[PDB]
Structure formats: structure tokens, C-alpha cells
Amino acid sequence: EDWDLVQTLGVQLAVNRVTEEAVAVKIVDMNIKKEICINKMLNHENVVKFYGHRREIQYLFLEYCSGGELFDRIEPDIGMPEPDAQRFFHQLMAGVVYLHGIGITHRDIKPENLLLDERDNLKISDFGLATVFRYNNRERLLNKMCGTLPYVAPELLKRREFHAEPVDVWSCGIVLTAMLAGELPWDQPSDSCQEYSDWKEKKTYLNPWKKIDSAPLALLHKILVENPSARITIPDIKKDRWYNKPL
């Protein structure tokens, strides 16, 4: 059936000639084989749906999110109301639990890859950098460096191998920091970085931590933990106090 390419989104918005259903089409001219492979395993309300692909230049048919990206809900230097931040983080955690549940790591979690549907539901998007980190119940450590510097965990910069799961968790905390303060805390989690050094020294009277409430800030203290082995895990995030706070 015929789809009209209405407009460019980033990827183009497509509308069905008969049903008028909307979808998004990723157009890549020749990573991609794996993107498709991974997309074929994914079925979750907090992950962008994969409809299919055509090998004409390659076409990926992906759920369309009229809400836009999460960054457009963050007023620079301000953030967003705490109740919206929490809801998005709840949904972000649901998405991430699912992926890790079937052994997949996104590896590039950031507001540019968190989309919103019409009810403002968050959808994890773009599995171009994603990889399988558990297969046949065996975990594989990662050694390739992927992601975006401000959202990347510190072990990815100093260690030759690392666990996939705590990396995604760190990035979710960076995203949470952004949702509540409108800014990113550091350019990268390296010790040459004054800002990351200040955090490691508990100077939370500076931004972005000054703008964050003590309850959500206590959770960030647990996520932005340099030792990936001491870093909080997702099941324990779900028991955190701000996480379960009525807002």
C-alpha cells in the first residue's frame, strides 16, 4: 500500500494513502543490519515500534511520535515541573528494564533519543548503536566506546572493559539531571573536568545540583556513582524514595 512522504522530521513522516496512519521512515544509503536485527526483537510500549524495512538505500518503518523529543520539554537552565520529570523517568526506566531484560543495551540514551507520543508517552529510539550484552544467559562485557560524551559513564573512558547495564543507568541519571535543571552537569565524566570533580567532592551548592530538590538529588547521588559496581541498580532505583513519591 502507498505511503506519502509528508515532510522531513530529522527520517520522514509518512502517511498511508488509504488509512492515513502515520509512521516514520529512516532513509539510509549504504550498523544498519544490526539496527534492523535488534528492532525485530523489540516489543514494548516505551520503545519505538518497528514495523518493517525494504531493501530498495534502505527504508526502516518506525513508530511515529507526534510528541517530539524530550529535549523540547526542557526549558534551558530551568528544566521542567518535577511531576513530569518523574513520570518520564518512570517510563524511561520501564523502557530500560525491558531492553536489559532481553539482553539489549541502547548505549546512547539522551533526550534526543527519547520521543513522546500523543499522550506524552516516552519512547526509546534509535538502536543504531545498540548491542546485545546477554545471550544464552551469558553476559558479555563491552569494550567498544559508544555514546555521547556528556551522557557517558566514567568507566567507559578509563576501562578497557565494562558492564553494559550500569552504563545505561548513568546516562538515565544524566537525563534526569537535565529534566530537573535544564542543563548538563559536565562535558564528560573525566577528572580533567572541573565540574565532574566538584560533584565528586559533593559541592552540590553549585549548579546544576542547587536547582534540584533533595529527594531527587539523593537519587542522583546514587546513580552518578563513579564506581560502576557501587552504582545503584534499576531494581533499587525502583525502591528509591523520590521514585515512589506521589507528585
Ligand SMILES: NC[C@H]1CN(c2c(Br)cnc3[nH]ncc23)CCO1
Ligand atoms: N529528535 C530526534 C529524532 C526525531 N525523529 C522522530 C520524530 Br520527531 C517522530 N517520530 C519518530 N520516529 N522515529 C523517529 C522519529 C526523527 C529523528 O530525529
